[PDB]
């Protein structure tokens, strides 16, 4: 059987996966024959190449035996065999050999981090997370960056190192992940530091988020400012939301600011905000805004104010026609 | 690399100058070459080595390591500068037909 397996390994088959399956079957037969060390030796001999092997496995010019070092299935089988048979040093050597061939996916980096965490090693898990982040920056490690952030939160690292890691993870991240990253950074700044850093992170997120989540981020920042500080601190930022949000979003922000000013007592500021919203929205297309302005004028506003509101509505109707 | 190359293609669409368009069309034409016929270039390299060794310009030496080295007295083999028979090169029918076909393809475009 060993001679037949060696002859099949020496047969240049078309598919390298066929040779990998034959090697895995030989290793399984050796393991069933109480030769797990011999199986690991045969697996290492099958995945034997130089320190800088760069032969593409998809290239249909070399033999499948030569293009067998970049086999992910054979490497995974060898790692699984050596995980329950050797110590952590051989597992680290196998991980380094897999990283040398650049055939390790984000799942491989996650498995290496889990193996490091299972061996009472947290700095090595952070090193593996950094390797996963550096090997694939933008798309393929945002989830790995989230896992690294979770590990750092569970490790209770120092504030400077955590801030540096959060800045590195949110440096060139896409906005769909950068919104959650900035929210987590603000939560960490509020939990383990002053609220000024969280406010600055929220302000940066309000200027660096997607247009769909810009209004939600602005509302969350306003709620956080009202919870952690005074409600007047959101007075200018909402004014900034007047200059940044989209037309319906700016109308909603102006309505919220007018409600806040009416609650505080700024009747003139609320009337000016309502007039700006009426100037920034058609009367026939935004009847809810006109109804809210009329309700506010009934709650606060005279007959002259009602006539001015009617004139503004007529002007908006003329502009929309 | 593919995404950054396509981003550079999108950024380079606007007319800057003529050397930039010249480089762009040269890269496009080199891409439209396809893979070069490395086996062919192997044959003319061996044939030119044979005729130059018969002409004494190239020298074949079996060194102490038992490998055939081919040293050049002049520089006429590498680049056909110093080789006054650069005029005597005659392209075959297929290459001239390929050139005329590509020029006519640009015309029809």
């Amino acid at each position: 059987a060993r001679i037949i397996m060696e002859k099949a390994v020496k047969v240049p088959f078309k598919s390298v996966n066929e040779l990998a399956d034959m090697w895995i079957e030989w290793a399984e037969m050796e393991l069933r024959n109480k030769n797990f060390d011999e199986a690991v030796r045969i697996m290492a001999k099958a995945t034997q190449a130089p320190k800088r092997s760069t032969v593409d496995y998809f290239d249909e010019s070399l033999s499948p035996q030569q293009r067998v070092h970049k086999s992910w299935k054979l490497w995974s089988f060898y790692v699984d065999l050596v995980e329950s048979t050797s110590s952590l040093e051989e597992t680290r050597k196998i991980y380094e050999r897999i990283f040398e061939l650049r055939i390790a996916t984000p799942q491989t980096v996650v498995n290496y981090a889990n193996l490091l965490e299972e061996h009472h090693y947290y700095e090595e898990s952070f090193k593996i997370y950094e390797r996963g982040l550096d090997l694939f920056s933008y798309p393929v490690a945002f989830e790995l960056w989230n896992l690294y952030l979770t590990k750092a939160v569970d490790r209770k690292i120092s504030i400077e190192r955590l801030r540096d890691l959060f800045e590195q993870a949110i440096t060139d991240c896409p906005p769909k992940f950068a919104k959650v990253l900035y929210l987590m950074y603000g939560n960490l700044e509020e939990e383990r530091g002053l609220a000024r850093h969280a406010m600055r992170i929220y302000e940066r997120a309000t200027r660096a988020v997607a247009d769909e989540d810009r209004a939600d981020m602005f509302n969350f920042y306003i709620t956080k400012s009202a919870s952690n500080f005074g409600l007047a601190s959101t007075r200018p930022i909402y004014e900034r939301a007047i200059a940044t949000l989209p037309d319906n979003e700016a109308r909603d922000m102006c309505l919220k600011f007018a409600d806040m000013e009416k609650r505080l007592g700024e009747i003139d500021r609320a009337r000016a905000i309502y007039g700006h919203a009426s100037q920034f929205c058609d009367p026939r297309t935004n009847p809810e805004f006109w109804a809210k302005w009329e309700q506010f004028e009934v709650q606060h506003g005279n007959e002259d104010t009602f006539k001015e509101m009617l004139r503004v509505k007529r002007s908006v109707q003329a502009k929309y026609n | 690399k593919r995404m950054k190359k396509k981003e550079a293609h999108r950024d380079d669409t606007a007319f800057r100058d003529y050397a930039r368009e010249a480089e762009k069309t040269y890269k496009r034409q080199i891409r439209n070459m396809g893979a070069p016929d490395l086996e062919k270039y192997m044959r003319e390299k061996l044939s030119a080595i044979e005729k130059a060794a018969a002409a004494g310009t190239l020298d074949i030496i079996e060194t102490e390591d038992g490998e055939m080295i081919a040293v050049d007295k002049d520089g006429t083999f590498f680049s056909t500068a110093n080789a006054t028979d650069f005029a005597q090169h005659k392209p075959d029918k297929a290459a001239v037909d390929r050139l005329v076909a590509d020029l006519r393809k640009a015309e029809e475009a």
Partner: protein, 48 residues
């Protein structure tokens, strides 16, 4: 010398608009009235 490197900013900065003549039509073109009054500077006068 090797040619100066031209950006798109320069190529748009040396764009000459077509002359909207309000005296002459040697080819009898029916120009829009919008283009006829663009070069007229009387529309840029402050009545103070």
């Amino acid at each position: 010398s090797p040619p100066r490197k031209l950006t798109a900013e320069d190529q748009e900065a040396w764009r000459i608009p077509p002359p909207v003549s309000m005296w002459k039509n040697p080819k009898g073109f029916t120009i829009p009235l919008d283009k006829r009054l663009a070069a007229d500077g009387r529309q840029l006068q402050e009545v103070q």
